[PDB]
Amino acid sequence: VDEHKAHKAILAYEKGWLAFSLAMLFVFIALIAYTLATHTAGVIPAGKLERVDPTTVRQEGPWADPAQAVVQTGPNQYTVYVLAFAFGYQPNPIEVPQGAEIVFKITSPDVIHGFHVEGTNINVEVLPGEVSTVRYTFKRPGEYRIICNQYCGLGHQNMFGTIVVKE
Amino acid sequence: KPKGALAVILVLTLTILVFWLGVYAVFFARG
Amino acid sequence: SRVYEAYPEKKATLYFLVLGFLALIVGSLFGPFQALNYGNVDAYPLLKRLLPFVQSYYQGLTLHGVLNAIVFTQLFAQAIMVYLPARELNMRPNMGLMWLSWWMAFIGLVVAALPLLANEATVLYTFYPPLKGHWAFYLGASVFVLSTWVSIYIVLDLWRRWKAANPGKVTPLVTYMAVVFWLMWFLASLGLVLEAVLFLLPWSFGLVEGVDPLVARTLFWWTGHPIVYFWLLPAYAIIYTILPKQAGGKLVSDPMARLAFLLFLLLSTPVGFHHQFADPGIDPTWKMIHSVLTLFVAVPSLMTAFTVAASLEFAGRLRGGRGLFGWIRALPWDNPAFVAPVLGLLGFIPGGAGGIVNASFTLDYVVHNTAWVPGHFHLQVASLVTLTAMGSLYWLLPNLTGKPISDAQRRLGLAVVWLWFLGMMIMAVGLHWAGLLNVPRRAYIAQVPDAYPHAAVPMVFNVLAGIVLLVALLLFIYGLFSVLLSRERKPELAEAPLPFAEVISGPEDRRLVLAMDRIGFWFAVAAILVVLAYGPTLVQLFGHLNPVPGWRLW
Ligand code: HAS
Ligand code: HEM
Ligand SMILES: CCCCCCCC/C=C\CCCCCCCC(=O)OC[C@H](O)CO
Ligand code: CUA
Ligand SMILES: [Cu+2]
């Protein structure tokens, strides 16, 4: 029948479509796996549970003195202890050299904040009681804006920070 | 043969590819 | 009438639908104001005069997300995925449980609503700790969602009774869809129920001092992905089993329809880390595994695209359409019940494309928590699911009320559905484009008018969308109340059968359907996948709990 011929012709093309579909998704998985094997994967947060007490992080430890928050931990590597709080970032500004690997260690003494550096793939959630660790290397010197992109209360839309990358 | 259906899945496929490859490029430009 | 005595499930279904549409209206009021905000126009001083209980942008955003995305979507799912299988089997659901489910939904909604309206739960529809809402918000939300466990029972009951009266027969298609839908939702729902019962309820009552925000988010997104397939599948049921008849054709494949719904049972729940790519404390290995599984959840929709397009082309040909594109012109573009879901499917193409980008792990760092994400999801739920619901008013409402649709109400419906679709498409351009310029989501940006100058052009699209969708909503309100409050009635509209489509069958079809009818086996497989996908991470997190104090920052 006309309809029997349609069922058969429709399923025939539908089987090719499904084969093409899977092939396409497999190619996407290969192209993602590639990004995980390059330097660009440093923006993925460390999977380690690094617990802190949000009630003492401003009183004791590496977040307590923002002026000593940038530390040389390697020959071309700096670790930055960043506090995201209602409603700002410390230190402000963050001052780092061009071309060095920057390990950002970010926590909150209050609620969840975002840490999104305009012009980069640095885009990480900051949970109180937890440390978010991400790595990045700035190629160009200048001013990069930090945007809080997680709703943190009525000050959210004004919560901005500054990274200065020096030649 | 379902030419019309094939035209729709051609438009879907190109939309997926322009979106995915566009952002893949943006990811490397910001990396 | 005597109709509600024979078919009392019609009265209960109507109560679900109307409560759903009322929630959609109140939630949607805030939309145009949010679009004007993403256009750098602050209209909130005007809104506060109209609705003086509104204290802030974020309180409006909470009402917007909760009423549209949680309340309206659930009530629509409860109406469609109980009533359609009941009518396919010609069997009466347990009307005691059915009324109980409605009263639970109604009480939970009133209780959740009070603190929302009084500015005591300005925490948004994700309510991420340690932002601490009033206990009534979490209690109300909990009772509202648990309504659906009664709905699961009602349909497993209908199916059990049917199989007992018909041993040896395969489940009918619509009942098959509803059964796998409700079993998927049972597995899905456990994340949020565990979060509410173990953490949010004791915390909000003062019985525990803190909550671990990483465990809270992990449990939330267990439910938080599959809840969007919970929104979607009632629209898919209508698009598969009803749209084809309305278009003048048939469903080209029963087995291909069943396969798509089975794949959603297996793959909808074990993927939630695609909401946690930017979370600390979750192993990248598990992120890559949830990413891969997320790309597989896309397959049923890739399949749906072909089966439905093939079904509409078939209808076009039957009606004398010729060529690559003549089948399109031959379709009933004068019928709002046809147009609404089809425009929804057109917007779903770019919508699905954005979803696949979002799913691809490292690509999410480009768009996470930007205006991109609301751009993506308005095409999925605010356009396809909502337009398919709006279209149902033209065939479902008469079937429940005996109230006919006048030709004028039909013409108004075509205008509403076109303006709604066009507004969502314009807003999608503005939000996708603002997102790639790093404009954040969930932000009163109109209060920092100098912060995002690079986004001036996309912001014009957001104002235009704001105005178009304000007009579409006002027309929708006028039209809905016109149909409800109209005095004319024709009872034997209410006695008519639903426009269920016929199916084309093949020699192949019976073997595939028996394989898929082993629902006990398939549910077991789905349950194990949840255990494998979540179990190891939850053991790690529960071993290292770090509860933190709550904050009110509004
Ligand atoms: C109903 C509601 C939704 C659906 C459906 C949905 C589908 C997907 N989404 Fe999504 N989504 C994500 C990935 C996906 C993927 C891979 C799919 C897939 O299921 C999509 C597959 C779809 C397709 C492949 C399209 C098929 C096309 C069809 C079927 C059209 C055919 C047309 C025809 C037949 C017309 C022909 C007619 C003619 C006349 C020619 C990710 C990441 O992986 C995030 C987190 C991002 C971040 O950073 O926060 C996310 C975020 C969201 C959020 C925000 C949560 C929040 O508030 O934080 C919501 C509400 C949402 C809703 C929905 N989403 N999504
Ligand atoms: C007139 C119709 C609508 C307009 C103009 C509109 C506009 C918006 C805009 C601009 C946002 C983003 C605001 C922000 O991130 O701060 C938003 C958020 C949202 N909208 Fe809509 N919307 C409409 C209808 C709907 C419908 C029908 C649904 C669901 C059925 C929906 C679900 C959502 C959700 C879930 C959010 C996110 C809430 C959150 O981030 O906490 N919207 N809406
Ligand atoms: C029928 C034909 C059968 C043949 C099938 C072939 C399909 C292979 C597809 C993709 C290749 C993946 C390429 C991986 C290389 C990545 C390179 C890249 O993206 O590099 C840009 C960036 O600048 C770096 O830092
Ligand atoms: Cu910090 Cu928003
Ligand atoms: Cu999801």
Output Rg (C-alpha) for chain A, integer angstroms: 23
Helices C173-188/C135-164 angle, 10° precision: 140
What is the distance in A from the centroid of ligand 1 to the CA of C229? 9
Residue C337 to residue C434: CA distance in whole angstroms: 33
Q: Does C58 qualify as catalytic in the annotation?
A: no
Residue pointed to by tokens 């179990």: C535
The H or E element containing residue C548 is strand C548-549
**Whether residue A91 has a cis bond before it, omega within 30° of 0:** yes
| Cβ neighbours, 10 Å, residue A25 | 18
- Name, in order, each residue with C-beta under 8 angstroms of C20's C-beta and a sequence gap of 6 or more: C71, C72, C74, C75, C76, C79, C389
For chain B, what's the residue count? 31
Query: Does ligand 3 lie within 6 Å of residue A24's CB atom?
Result: no
**Cα–ligand 4 centroid distance for C249 (angstroms):** 52
Is C353 touching ligand 1 by the criterion CB < 6 Å?
no
Q: Do the annotations mark residue C544 as ligand-binding?
A: no
Reduced to 3 states, what is the DSSP secondary structure of residue C549?
strand
**How many Cβ atoms sit within 10 Å of the Cβ of residue C359?**
25
Give dist(CA C528, CA C36) in Å, integer.
46
Domain identity same for A88 and A22 = no
Q: Which of C238, C260, C85, C110 is nearest to C172 (CA)?
A: C85
> Which residue of chain A is at minimal alpha-carbon distance from B12?
A21
Give the CA dihedral C130, C135, C136, C137, nearest 10 degrees: 10
Respond yes or no: is residue A87 known to be catalytic. yes
* Residue spans per domain, chain C: 2-549
Q: How far apart are CA C172 and CA C413, in angstroms?
A: 32
Q: After which residues is chain B broken (C to N over 2.5 A)?
A: none
- Token match 């939300």: residue? C141
Exposed/middle/buried for residue C450 (C-beta within 10 Å: 0-12, 13-18, 19+)? exposed
CA distance C78 to C234: 9
> Are C448 and A157 in contact (CB < 8 Å)?
yes
Among residues C352, C409, C360, the alpha carbon closest in space to that of C383 is found at: C352
Say how far apart CA C27 and CA C33 lie, in whole Å.
12
CA–CA distance from C487 to each of C17, C21, C390, C401, C483 (Å)?
A: 20, 20, 21, 11, 9
Closest ligand, as measured to the CA of B28? 3
Domain C2-549 matching CATH 1.20.210.10: the answer reads: yes
Query: DSSP readout, chain A?
Result: -HHHHHHHHHHHHHHHHHHHHHHHHHHHHHHHHHHHTSGGGGGSPP-S--B--TTTTTTSSTTS-GGG-EEEEETTEEEEEEEEETTEEESSSEEEETTSEEEEEEEBSSS-EEEEETTSS-EEEE-BTB-EEEEEE--S-EEEEEE--S--STTGGG-EEEEEEE-
Interior angle at CA A63, CA A60 and CA A69, nearest 5: 130
Contact A135/A66 with Cβ under 8 angstroms?
no
Ligand 3 centroid to residue A31 C-alpha, Å:
7
Residue count (chain C): 554
- The residue annotated as part of the active site, out of C314, C376, C394, C523, is C376
Buried b (16+ CB within 10 A) or exposed e, A145-154: ebbbbbbbbb
**Least CA distance to B27: which residue of chain A?**
A121
Are C104 and C142 in contact, with CB atoms under 8 Å apart? no
Q: Are A89 and A114 in contact (CB under 8 A)?
A: no
Residue the block writes with tokens 């012109």: C329
Alpha carbon separation from C357 to B15, B21, C271, C376 (Å, rounded): 11, 9, 15, 10
Structural contact between residues A89 and A161, judged by C-beta atoms closer than 8 angstroms: yes
Q: Which residue of C has its CA nearest to B11?
A: C349
What residues of A are in contact with residue C546 (Cβ under 8 Å)? 51, 129-130
- On whether both A59 and A105 belong to a single domain, the answer is yes
B7 with C324: Cβ contact below 8 A: yes
Question: Token pair of C216, please?
Answer: 């809270």
Please name the residues in contact with C474: beta carbons below 8 A apart, sequence gap of 6 or more.
Answer: none
A80 and A161 assigned to the same domain: yes
What technique determined this structure? X-ray
Q: CA-to-CA distance for C554 and C551, rounded, in angstroms?
A: 9
- In this structure, the answer to whether residues A18 and A39 fall within a common structural domain is yes
Q: Say how many domains are in chain A.
A: 2
First to last CA, chain C: 50
Q: Of C535, C289, C490, which Cα lies nearest the Cα of C400?
A: C490
C226 upstream amide cis, omega within 30 of 0: no
Three-class SS state of C122: coil
Residue nearest to atom 1 of ligand 4 (CA): A113
Strand order in the sheet with A113-117: A94-97, A160-166, A142-147, A113-117, A123-126
| Pairing outcome for strands A160-166 and A94-97 | parallel
CA atoms within 13 A on the CB side of C320: 1
Q: Is C273 exposed, middle or buried (0-12, 13-18, 19+ CB in 10 A)?
A: buried
Q: Are residues A56 and A111 in the same domain?
A: yes
Q: What type of residue is C266? A: L
Q: Are residues A83 and A155 in the same domain?
A: yes
CB–CB contact C353 B15 (8 Å)? yes
Query: Which of C316, C352, C363 is nearest residue B4 as measured by Cβ atoms?
Result: C316
Does residue C442 come out as left (phi exceeding 0), alpha (psi in the -120 to 50 range) or beta?
left
For residue C352, give the chain B residue with the closest CA: B16
Same domain, A19 and A58: no
Ligand number nearest to the C-alpha of B21:
3
CA distance linking residue C338 with residue C319, whole number of Å: 15
The Cα–Cα gap between C128 and C213 comes to 7
Ligand of minimum distance to the alpha carbon of C274: 1
Whether residue A100 sits in one domain with residue A67: yes
Catalytic residue among C134, C217, C290, C378: C378
Q: Which of B3, B6, B8, B9 is the best substitution to test chain A (most A C-beta atoms within 10 A)? A: B9
Confirm whether residue A148 is marked as ligand binding: yes
Tokens coding C114: 């009070």
For chain C, the C-alpha Rg in angstroms (whole number) is 23
Which of A13, A31, A38 is the closest to B6 by Cβ?
A13
Structure tokens at C289: 């595994």
User: How far apart are alpha carbons C466 and C474 in whole angstroms?
Assistant: 12
Q: How far is residue C151's CA from residue C148's CA, in Å, rounded to a whole number?
A: 5
- Decide: C31 in ligand 2 pocket, CB within 6 A: yes
- Written as one string, the DSSP assignment of C275-338 is G-TT-SSS-HHHHHHHHHHHHHHHHHHHHHHHHHHHHHHHHHHHTT--TTTHHHHTS-TT-HHH
Q: Domain check: are A80 and A13 in the same one?
A: no
Residue A21 lies in domain: 1-45
Half-sphere exposure of B19 (CA within 13 A, CB side): 25
CB contact under 8 A, A36 and C214: no
Residue from C83, C277, C377, C452 carrying the catalytic annotation: C377
Residues C309, B9: Cα–Cα separation, whole Å: 8
Asked whether the beta carbons of A156 and C442 are under 8 A apart, the reply is: yes
CA distance A119 to chain B (A): 6
DSSP C347-401: HHHHHHHHHHHHHSGGGHHHHTTBTHHHHHHIIIIIIIIHHHHHHHTTTHHHHHH
Cβ contacts of C47 within 8 Å, gap of 6 or more: C30, C33, C54, C60
Distance from CA of C547 to the nearest CA of A (A): 8
Reduced DSSP (H G I as helix, E B as strand, rest coil) percent helix, strand, coil of chain B, to 5: 85, 0, 15
For ligand 4, whether the C-beta of A148 sits within 6 Å is yes
**A55: phi then psi, degrees, rounded to nearest 5:** -80, -15
The residue written with tokens 């751009």 in the block is C375
Counting every residue written for chain A, the total comes to 167
Directed axis angle between helix C284-318 and helix C519-543, to 10°? 150
- Resolution to 1 decimal, in Å? 2.1
User: Do A105 and A122 fall into the same domain?
Assistant: yes
Q: How far is CA C77 from CA B22, C10, C151, C305, C404, in A?
A: 36, 15, 10, 21, 24
A156 annotated binding-site participant: yes
What token pair was written down for A6? Answer: 């349609």
Q: Which two tokens stand for residue C21?
A: 């549409």
Contact of C152 with C82, CB cutoff 8 Å:
no
Q: Is ligand 1 within 6 A of the CB of residue C21?
A: no
Residues A41 and A103 placed together within one structural domain of the fold: no
CA-closest residue to ligand 1 atom 48: C368
Taken in order A118, A124, A125, A127, the sign of the CA dihedral is negative
CA atoms B7, B13, B16, B18: torsion sign: negative
Residue A93 shares a structural domain with residue A134: yes
CA distances (Å), C234 to each of C74, C76, C366, C488, in order? Answer: 10, 8, 32, 30
